[PDB]
């Protein structure tokens, strides 16, 4: 008896997700492609941030991802930055950015 996450070819728990959709009270019933579909979507999005965040770390001379890295990954991507526009990442700081008119008169 192989698991559904395997059948769908995924890491995320198709089973845990299904259980959460029921106990979550979103509807009287829940199809089966749903927990699968939804599960796949969560995974993809996870990979998408972790990917960028790795980058952020590598290009920072580090191998261990930390909040700063997730913050730079998100705030530097138009798509993701919109998805989490009203979200605050603890310990992420802000993107280095100084308004031009405030730079030494030069």
């Amino acid at each position: 008896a192989k698991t559904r996450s395997s059948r769908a070819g995924l890491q995320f728990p198709v089973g845990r997700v299904h259980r959460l959709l029921r106990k979550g009270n979103y509807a009287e019933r829940v199809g089966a492609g749903a927990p699968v579909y939804l599960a796949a979507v969560l995974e993809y999005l996870t990979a998408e941030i972790l990917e960028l965040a790795g980058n952020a770390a590598r290009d920072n001379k580090k191998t261990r991802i930390i909040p700063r890295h997730l913050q730079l990954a998100v705030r530097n991507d138009e798509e993701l930055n919109k998805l989490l526009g009203r979200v605050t990442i603890a310990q992420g700081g802000v993107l280095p950015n100084i308004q031009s008119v405030l730079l030494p008169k030069k």
Binding site: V87, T88, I89, A90, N97, L102
Partner: protein
Amino acid sequence: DNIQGITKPAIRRLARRGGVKRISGLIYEETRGVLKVFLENVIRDAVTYTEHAKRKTVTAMDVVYALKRQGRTLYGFGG
């Protein structure tokens, strides 16, 4: 007092992270008050969630749920 405990130096640091280069003298008193209102609005709901759960301790979750409905979602404290 306590809101007065939030020092000028800290507010200058905050502003700096924000990119501010010159800070008017009248900014500090104005800031503390904006901050006080934030906290009051947020704690007020954190406390309400607490009471609803029959506890005497405000839990990190209580604050996260509070921030969530103020539209100030915060990641990194469970849930």
